[PDB]
Design a protein around this ligand. Sequence first.
Ligand SMILES: Nc1ncnc2c1ncn2[C@@H]1O[C@H](COP(=O)(O)OP(=O)(O)OP(=O)(O)O)[C@@H](O)[C@H]1O
Ligand SMILES: Nc1ncnc2c1ncn2[C@@H]1O[C@H](COP(=O)(O)OP(=O)(O)OP(=O)(O)O)[C@@H](O)[C@H]1O
Ligand SMILES: [Mg+2]
Ligand SMILES: [Mg+2]
Lengths: 263, 264
Amino acid sequence: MSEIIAVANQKGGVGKTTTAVNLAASLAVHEKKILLIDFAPQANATSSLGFRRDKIDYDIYHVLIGRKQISQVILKTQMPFLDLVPSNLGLAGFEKTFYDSQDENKRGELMLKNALESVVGLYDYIIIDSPPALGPLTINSLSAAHSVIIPIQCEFFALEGTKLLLNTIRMLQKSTNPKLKIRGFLPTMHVPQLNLTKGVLAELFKYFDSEFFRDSATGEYIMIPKSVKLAESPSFGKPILLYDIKSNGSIAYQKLAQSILQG
Amino acid sequence: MMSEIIAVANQKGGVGKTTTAVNLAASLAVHEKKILLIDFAPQANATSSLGFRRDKIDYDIYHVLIGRKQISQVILKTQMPFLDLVPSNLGLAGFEKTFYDSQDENKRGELMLKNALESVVGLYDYIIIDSPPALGPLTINSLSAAHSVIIPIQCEFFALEGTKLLLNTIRMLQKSTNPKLKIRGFLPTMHVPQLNLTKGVLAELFKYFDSEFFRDSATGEYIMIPKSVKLAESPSFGKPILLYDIKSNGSIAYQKLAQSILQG
Ligand SMILES: Nc1ncnc2c1ncn2[C@@H]1O[C@H](COP(=O)(O)OP(=O)(O)OP(=O)(O)O)[C@@H](O)[C@H]1O
Ligand SMILES: Nc1ncnc2c1ncn2[C@@H]1O[C@H](COP(=O)(O)OP(=O)(O)OP(=O)(O)O)[C@@H](O)[C@H]1O
Ligand SMILES: [Mg+2]
Ligand SMILES: [Mg+2]
């Protein structure tokens, strides 16, 4: 039975896709069976794994509207234990479908959850990459999930942003997903010596210190460092472990996976 | 006054749309041009960048769009006399539902921002719109209202696939709802010239798009916003960078950007 993990932040460019891709790969290297769901219309996760937009046939949007079952759209990747549900531009049509269903039921929030029900016994982990909004796509991600990883870029808008995302999660924990947990807060693109980084982290630590990911071996906080090689990796269509497994970016995501595998 | 309405748009997240909208607006304001900044994103980062608390704001752009308030009822004065703000709130996430209601009955909704701006176009020299990271109803409304669009581009790998897709949306709107819409220009942001990935991405962008890039007409140079510690720090003080550090490289770059706009 899958643990379904959403990677969510409504702030743009905070490392959601990079985290979802590289965590899924770092778990798959252990020969745990992993499904990555690209839940964003811009489809950066799909492209990160080497799949160009013009080569995608049927995608997650076709599953949500019922043209395809989810087993029909699953792609195998270069890693034998990592599978991908690709996305495409057509997933921007989901918003229309969501509000239409809310005139035919109350159930639009559960459309991804219902789509995943035939694969939950086939994978150890299902990782969902969310778009930068609190709209219907992210609401579907969080309603399908057992847990949520929040990548945090520590710059100024993270302060107001983290508080809002947590309020969204609390409201879902009342209504549509009572079992939903914060898996953890993960600092991404992290540059420890910056004063802005220090100020933002200190503020988040006051309220949130128990939510930050820690190394299961050393007890240290797990943070993903700003890394030239991490930014280069989707241009090769590979997660960073498949080529440079000794870079600091690769080592950090591997620490994250080890922390997830403990439970 | 006849406003030039400029949208700042990219569906990629975190590429500097808000930083560009706020700092271009301030850089135009110091030339005694009357500027209206519209925060068109539900996350409301432009509102926070100018020193306002989102939770303290009663009525915003969402209420204007659905017709509950006139735009002149929600306009706030900022610290700079020539720069006014229409704030945003999380309630702007409700607009999508309103849009798809309007598309269902009369097939409208693209023009809701344009219609809302009609009473202020004679009152401002420039109206700058900060868009959210999506190609949805809010970005469709900002591009349908605009004379021109500035596309901030972070030059990392997803810029290549993403730029073409935004251009497609722009072309489709140029055929239907907004024929006058032009690209004002592509603006490289968070730019670190020495990186191999930066060089590779820019070479490919110049290959397809060279004529679209912002230029300093005095030197012929490409205008790029450098990665700057101070640019990231400035919204934490509720100031644009020219009020925070006017001599910093990011300040100098946004003033060059404003010169390019002002020269025509
Ligand atoms: N640790 C890191 N070091 C350096 N660059 C990074 C790191 N993490 C991500 N990046 C780069 O930063 C950019 C933004 O990251 P990414 O696209 O993963 O964020 P996102 O939150 O998924 O964005 P969006 O909101 O558009 O979905 C990408 O170009 C990526 O290659
Ligand atoms: N040239 C720069 N140098 C350093 N930091 C920058 C620069 N431009 C923007 N930033 C910082 O990078 C982050 C992303 O910028 P910003 O929020 O303006 O992007 P955006 O495209 O509006 O994001 P979103 O997609 O979330 O709306 C912000 O924290 C900002 O303070
Ligand atoms: Mg992403
Ligand atoms: Mg923004």
